[model samples]
Target: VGGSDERFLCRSIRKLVQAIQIEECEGADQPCDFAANFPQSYNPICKQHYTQKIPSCCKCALKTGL
Candidate 1:
């Protein structure tokens, strides 16, 4: 399965659907944003599957051990 950069927003344990989209930039000190942006999809599993391509966030998630 493919993935995307969005998956690494927060630590891997949060498991909140919206947390997936949080973008964490380098040297920000503060962690990624998870509260401001609500997950477009309530279903976390489905969101992972649906957004598996395009930006390929999920792929990065596994690679980084998130």
Candidate 2:
């Protein structure tokens, strides 16, 4: 951990069979390039975030999910 001016960096969401050596960041449409620089996040044009319960993308949901 660092001081006030420091922040923890991120890489990879999981370590799988071949090993997830997260070397990139994703965006709303295409693959990443050189660490996919962004101060926030991205999602596909067809997806959205909701805080319902079961969770869901902008496409489908039943149980009145996110």
Candidate 3:
């Protein structure tokens, strides 16, 4: 129930990261912005990554220049 929702949030961001990685997305100006694509979803995932202090997630953010 509620617990499943939490995993959903994490997996959503995980998929985004995978997509960016597979495509080798990068640029001086963000090559791909999940924030724009998943308006309602991005913030929750981004917030979790920040507060959880997950380096892997942060690496993708930096790699993608987002």
Q: Candidate 3, overall lDDT?
A: 0.31
- What lDDT does candidate 3 reach at residue 25? 19
Cα RMSD (Å) per model? 16.0, 15.0, 11.5
Evaluated at residue 43, the lDDT of candidate 3 is: 38
Candidate 3 vs. true structure, TM-score:
0.16
lDDT of each: 0.30, 0.29, 0.31
- Model 1 stretches astray by more than 4 angstroms: 1-6, 10-25, 37-66
Best of the two (1, 2) by TM-score: 1
Ranking by TM-score: 1, 3, 2
Candidate 3 lDDT, tens digit per residue, 1-66? 565532221222333442442222122223233344544433322212333333233222322325
Tens digits of per-residue lDDT, candidate 2, 7-49, equal 2122212223234322222233333333334333332222233
What tens-digit string does per-residue lDDT give for candidate 1 at 1-66?
A: 587554444333223242454322232233343434445432222112223332222211221223
Best by TM-score: 1
